[PDB]
């Protein structure tokens, strides 16, 4: 009964303290509607934090568990725990001699850090990372590995703002190891954590590369579990947003055959993601476009330009359009894209409700044309302009002249003025 429990918590006797606190732990453990607020109203959160420094590990544990589940509630409920000064103590408890106390401290810090980026940063400010990274390297207990990895992902997670880089960066070596874990759940949280850190500028990508992480990520693209594949894919995608040499690391770890496979994944998200990743590889140099061609990725893409949802058609559009970048250096590539039937599905997208997509399809089609114009002058017509005319594409370019986006209509005009006078 609630007021007797309050009495127990404020008793100075360790056994009264422990019976009471356990009852609170159990009540905050309810599956449906834990009365977090009623508990908070009683005034005991301050006590639970005192209990965190008792020499009796059991009350440390029960207190930590109660606190963990208050911090599992709303932002204001979490803040009550933060206000009480629990976080610097939880960091001390990462060094407790008693493994369950350490684990519960890890768990509490996960929940607190998970409430928001500001909260995340607060926890990092209290020196949480280093002792967490240590537990991750030493512990053999699977539950602790699961918990500490998940909590590590919460330390990495968030963009408004992102964690300070030098502060969170030491996580990379530990994550490089956790992705070889034999546990699926560790694998998942590790991969998510990596995808948060790899989402950034090229220097951050570089740090991921030099931790040695790319090789195992690519291998995890083909993991049985879509829950593993998704964040591993996300991370590989992030990497190839880097420069050409950084992108080349991903090619050299054999990602292209995996990306070819992932195009046929049963999850829409993975397919869409796979296309986005490929588009950033075909945004690269001539040789990297050629890699995508030699991997037979182009036909599935061109197929996806017509099939599956619009978000998919959008990403495939970027991928194919990007691939038309080297008409000057290696025009053989465009002629290959044309021969695999890219023109007609590109023309279709000119009527896309998204203006960026219209521009991307228009760009691709201008590059297609310039090669046909080079083949024309070395022969007598531009056969690419002809196929664009008779497939109905010329009329769709014509309609782009009524588009208001300056980039779009001016681009559409010159194509008509140049290849369709």
């Amino acid at each position: 009964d609630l007021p007797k429990m309050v009495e127990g918590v404020f008793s100075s006797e360790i056994d009264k303290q422990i019976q009471a606190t356990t009852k609170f732990r159990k009540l905050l453990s309810k599956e449906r509607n834990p009365p977090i607020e009623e508990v908070i109203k009683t005034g005991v959160v301050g006590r639970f934090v005192e209990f965190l420094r008792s020499p009796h590990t059991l009350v440390q544990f029960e207190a930590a568990w109660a606190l963990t589940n208050i911090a599992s509630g709303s932002a204001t409920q979490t803040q009550v725990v933060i206000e009480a000064g629990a976080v610097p103590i939880f960091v001390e408890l990462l060094g407790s001699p008693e493994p369950d106390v350490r684990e519960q401290a890890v768990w509490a810090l996960g929940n607190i850090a998970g409430d928001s980026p500001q909260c995340r940063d607060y926890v990092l400010s209290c020196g949480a990372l280093r002792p967490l990274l240590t537990l991750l390297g030493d512990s053999r207990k699977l539950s602790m590995l699961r918990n500490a990895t998940w909590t590590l992902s919460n330390f990495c997670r968030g963009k408004t703002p992102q964690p300070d880089w030098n502060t969170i960066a030491p996580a990379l070596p530990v994550l490089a190891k956790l992705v070889y874990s034999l546990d699926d759940e560790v694998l998942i949280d590790a991969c998510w954590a990596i995808s948060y850190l790899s989402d950034g500028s090229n220097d951050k990508i570089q740090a991921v590369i030099e931790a040695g992480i790319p090789r195992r990520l690519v291998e995890l693209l083909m993991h049985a579990s879509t829950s593993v594949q998704t964040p591993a894919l996300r991370s590989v995608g992030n990497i190839v947003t880097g420069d050409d040499v950084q992108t080349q690391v991903i090619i050299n770890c054999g990602a292209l055959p995996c990306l070819l496979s992932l195009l046929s994944s049963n999850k829409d998200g993975i397919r869409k993601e796979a296309c986005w990743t490929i588009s950033n590889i075909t945004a690269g140099n001539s040789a990297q476009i050629q890699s995508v061609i030699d991997a037979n990725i182009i036909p599935p893409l061109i197929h996806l330009l017509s099939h599956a949802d619009l978000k998919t058609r959008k990403e495939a559009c970027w991928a194919i359009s990007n691939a038309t970048s080297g008409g000057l250096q290696k025009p053989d590539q465009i002629r290959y894209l044309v021969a695999q039937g890219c023109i007609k599905p590109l023309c279709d997208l000119l009527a896309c409700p998204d203006n960026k997509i219209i521009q991307v399809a228009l760009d691709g089609l201008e590059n297609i044309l310039k090669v046909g114009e080079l083949d024309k002058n070395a022969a007598s017509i531009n056969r690419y302009a002809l196929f664009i005319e008779e497939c109905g594409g010329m009329e769709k370019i014509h309609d782009c002249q009524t588009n208001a986006n300056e980039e779009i209509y001016m681009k559409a005009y010159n194509i008509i003025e140049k290849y369709f006078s």
């Binding site: 453990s29 834990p34 568990w65 963990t68 599992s72 768990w107 929940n111 998970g114 409430d115």
Partner: peptide
């Protein structure tokens, strides 16, 4: 939600 209640 990136939080976990215990039990």
């Amino acid at each position: 939600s990136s939080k976990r209640q215990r039990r």
